[PDB]
Design a protein around this ligand. Structure first.
Ligand SMILES: [Ca+2]
Length: 421
């Protein structure tokens, strides 16, 4: 049944509550109520529900200042993080993850991992409405196999502002899909304070918040991220969307080779596309790049390895990319070596499509086409094994479009060439 650890007390920085007795859950769910200042430093083993009701902004999983953390690798259950607002006026109500004196390098993820807090890699974690999940100062990482957040929750990153403070949440190792519906943004929306997501594993993470500011960017190493915020509302009300705006230099999304970005919402930051772009979410949709808050151009940064997949049901229903900015091709690969290979467009009619001769599909619309070093480039096209196509790259009235036109319902062999060789 249930064990309850009620550790709450109206305490201060000078009277921390510390609980460190090992827990073997057995057949019991646990419910733990923490004080504002709490060191929850118990080794936990079991496969039951562990619910952590956090009484303030100094409840640590581990010790003060994130100096150490207990073993949770034998915890295989569900960790649920809730607020507990009995003590009012706190900066936030949630859990501070520890770093164990270790620093994370977002540029060398593989080399950072084996010394990063990886205790929550055999369980699931759910961050509930009103709860915050934060880290301390410095540049820190945590590996969480499966994280879902509810609307009204906050992935904060560092508990305090600073250019030297950065928090990277390495999510997805379970291989399962998850939903980040709560906010992802640093304290005070401070632009210099970094909070980042690093996506690994085979599954897809869906991001739906409309007021994010992912200052440490999303780095997609494996699987997919869908930006599924309410873009129509974000346009009208001038909201940040799923990413927010990082400016004209730093990408908000790095899609590495083999991984994918997609969705029905929008990025207000540069997408650096080494990998795949799949508009919609396992189906037809429109993905937008646009900054509704500050009105600046947002470019799609294309690479020699870029691939863009367009599913097409009809002239009325097909995948679209809209860029309120330029298609900006960099002839530099993931390894910094030059290549003259250009992005591939995959034209993919559905199994029950109603395409007709003369249908013109505007797959990509942008303000312009640009390039590192002003080197001219065109998309390579992977045609399907049906119909006959003309692809038209059109610059007109100071705007750009990539159009696929159906010339015949008969097949003319255009799909026999495997472009990616
Ligand atoms: Ca699609």
């Amino acid at each position: 049944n249930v064990k309850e650890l009620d550790l709450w007390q109206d305490n201060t920085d000078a009277s921390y509550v510390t609980y460190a007795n090992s827990i073997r859950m057995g057949s019991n769910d646990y419910k733990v109520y923490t004080a504002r200042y709490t060191e929850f430093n118990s080794v936990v083993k079991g496969d039951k529900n562990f619910s952590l009701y956090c009484g303030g902004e100094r409840t640590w999983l581990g010790t003060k200042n994130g100096a150490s953390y207990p073993s949770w690798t034998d915890f295989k259950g569900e960790l649920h993080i809730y607020p507990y607002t009995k003590k009012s006026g706190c900066g936030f109500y949630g859990l501070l993850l520890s770093h164990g004196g270790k620093t994370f390098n977002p540029e060398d993820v593989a080399g950072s991992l084996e010394k990063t807090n990886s205790e929550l890699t055999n369980c699931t974690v759910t961050l509930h409405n009103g709860a915050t999940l934060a880290m301390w100062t410095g540049v820190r990482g945590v590996r969480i196999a499966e994280l879902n957040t509810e609307e009204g929750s906050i992935i904060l990153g560092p508990a305090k502002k600073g250019s030297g403070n950065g928090s990277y949440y390495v999510l997805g190792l379970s291989g399962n899909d998850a939903l980040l519906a709560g906010q992802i943004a640093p304290t005070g929306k401070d632009a210099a304070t970094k909070v980042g997501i690093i996506k690994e594993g085979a599954g897809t993470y869906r991001i739906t918040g409309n007021d994010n500011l992912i200052t440490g960017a999303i780095r997609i190493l494996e699987g997919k991220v869908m930006l599924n915020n309410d873009v129509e509302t974000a346009r009208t009300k001038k909201m940040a969307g799923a990413i927010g705006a990082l400016g004209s230099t730093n990408p908000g999304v790095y899609v590495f080779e083999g991984a994918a970005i997609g969705g029905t919402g929008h990025s207000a930051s540069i997408i650096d596309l080494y990998g795949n772009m799949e508009p919609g979410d396992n189906g037809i949709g429109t993905l937008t790049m646009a900054d509704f808050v500050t009105g600046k151009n947002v470019d799609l940064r294309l690479r020699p390895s870029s691939k863009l997949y367009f599913e097409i049901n009809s002239a009325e229903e097909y995948d679209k990319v809209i860029v309120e900015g330029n298609l900006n091709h960099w002839n530099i690969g993931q390894d910094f070596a030059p290549s003259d290979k250009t992005p591939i467009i995959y034209i993919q009619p559905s199994e029950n499509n109603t395409l007709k001769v003369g249908d013109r599909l505007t797959l990509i619309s942008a303000k312009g086409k640009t390039a590192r070093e002003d080197i001219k480039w065109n998309f390579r096209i992977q045609y399907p094994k049906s119909l006959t196509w003309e692809v038209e790259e059109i610059e007109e009235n100071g705007t750009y479009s990539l159009v696929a036109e159906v010339k015949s319902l008969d097949y003319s062999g255009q799909g026999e060439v495997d472009v990616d060789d």
